[PDB]
Structure 1
């Protein structure tokens, strides 16, 4: 035998030892999955809900902008629907992490908005379109409104994007926890602690609490080091929640006021151009539920021993090799810590 230390005879061969080793691996993985399932499902639920809620907010804001265009500026439709749809499509694509430039969103929005304003509201009566698009920025017809919207929406969209990516990376690392492959020596120690008692002919004897403690603190020396970074992740997420609904919903008022502002100087503009051419509640409940799992990595070996059959009294128990009266007494982890450091820096820089 290569795992079961043979003190007397033995009721099991080498192949039965391999079977016990595979069952030990699977039992450890199942225990880790059972430990991590509640937190995994919490973060998965919240990620899905926040994603759908942000999409609902973006759709409602696009709808509100379209409705106020229909109501206040019917002369700008249906072209208004095209650029509003493109703007909010790029909004959602940015929220979901795609490479979108916010300044470019706002600038293309006003570039498309100005020519229809000039042709339908100021000078009623397609080839000259690009001259108007250039004059929009060259004459600063919209004043400070484009930069106001630019900062207003970039500030909220960046924090929302990083919030979603933080939730997804938490899901990723919690998924990594239950798939942690361990050393061969730990495989043999778990086989001895859980099954090698059966090879000596014992039926209901459980391993000693202290033996479970030494084994678990033996193979979880690396996993426990993640606890500092996981705690910093929780606290940085709390730092970030303490924003995007109000901005996207006031966008219509800001655009209407910008259109008024441009119409205010129509006299000079027409002549010059004619010559020239419950969310906050949810994230609060999420942070308050996430703080209940701040001890997850530090309490993990305690969980494995308290949910495995063990003799807590350390009396008449299995010590890995014999029945005693009293007990005597990185690469994947590195990737988890790397991603936690990255997301923690990204969190801390926002707030």
Structure 2
């Protein structure tokens, strides 16, 4: 044989030994799944919930701005509907990780807003439109409203996007956990601990607790090293939580004040242009339930040994090759570590 150390006779051949190895692999994967399932489901739930909540906030802000335009500036519709939809679509896209520039969003928004104001509010009575678009930026007609809006929305949308990315990366690492393949020697040790006692003709003998401890510390060598980075990830996320909704809601008030500011100088603007041309409760509850899993990678070998048939008394147990009366005594992991380092640096530099 090549796994079960044959002290004398044996009831199993090499094929039954490969069978025991495959069953050991399946049992280890099932145990890791049972250990990680609750945290995995928690992070998947929260990711879905916060994404839906943010989409609801974006939609609410969208037709709030639409309603304010419809009620206060009916002459600017339906063009206002079009560029407000464009702006909030780009906002949702930037929230979902797309390569979108916030300053460019605000600039395109105001470049679309100014010509309809000039043609429908200041000079009631199309092809010179680009000249008006230029006059929007060359005369700074909106004053300091554009830079204010740029900073206000950029801060909140960036922190929200980084929050969603952190949630997805947590999902990714916890889902990689239960799929971790171990070395051949670790597999042979698991086969010796769980099934090689049957090859010797034993029926109810369980492996020693200390033997399980040494086998699991040998197997989970690199996996325990993930504990520091996982703890720092949890702490950085808690630091980041301690908002995107308030900014997107006050957007309509700021846009209305900007339109009034523009209209206050129409006298000279028309002349010079004619001459020239529960969410916070959900984050808090998520953080409180997540802090309970800060020791997930440190208590994982303990979980594997405590949720498997073991002789914790270390009396009449299987040491891997014989029945004793007293026991005597990376690449994928590196990728998880690198991803954790990246997300931790992002969370640190944010707040």
Q: TM-score, normalised by structure 1?
A: 1.00
Q: CA deviation at 1:203?
A: 1.1
SS state of the match for residue 326, structure 1? coil
* Ranges of 4+ aligned residues in structure 1 off by more than 3 Å: none
> What's the secondary structure of 2:224's corresponding residue?
coil
Please report how far the alpha carbon of residue 161 of structure 1 lies from its aligned counterpart in structure 2 after TM superposition: 0.2
Deviation at 1:126, TM superposition (A): 1.2
Q: What are structure 2's unaligned runs of at least 5 residues?
A: none
Describe the superposition over 1:68-88 as per-residue Cα deviations: whole angstroms up to 9, x where unpaired: 000000000000000000000
Cα offset, 1:93, TM superposition:
0.1
**C-alpha offsets along residues 151-179 of structure 1, whole Å, 9 cap, x if unaligned?**
00000000000000000000000011111
| Alignment-derived partner of residue 149 in structure 1 | 149
Q: Deviations over 1:279-317 (max 9, x none)?
A: 100000000000000000000000000001000000111
Cα deviation per residue 1:150-209 (whole Å; 9 max; x = unaligned)? 000000000000000000000000011111110100000000000000101111111000
* Secondary structure, counterpart of 1:309 in structure 2: coil
Query: Residue 293 of structure 1: SS of its match in structure 2?
Result: coil
If the length of structure 2 is used for normalisation, what is the TM-score?
A: 1.00
Deviation larger for 318-327 or 99-108: 318-327
Q: CA deviation at 1:108?
A: 0.2
SS in structure 1 opposite 2:316?
strand
Q: Deviations over 1:74-115 (max 9, x none)?
A: 000000000000000000000000000000000000000000
**Structure 1 residue 242 displacement after superposition:** 1.2
State the number of aligned residues.
351
C-alpha distance in structure 1 between counterparts of 2:247 and 2:334, whole Å: 40
Deviation digits for residues 307-351 of structure 1, max 9, x if unmatched?
Answer: 010000001111111111111111101000000000000110100
5+ residue gaps, structure 1: none
SS at match of 2:202: coil
Alignment of 1:260 with 2:260, yes or no, is: yes
Could you give the per-residue CA deviations for residues 205-224 of structure 1, whole angstroms, max 9, x where no partner exists? 11000000000011111000
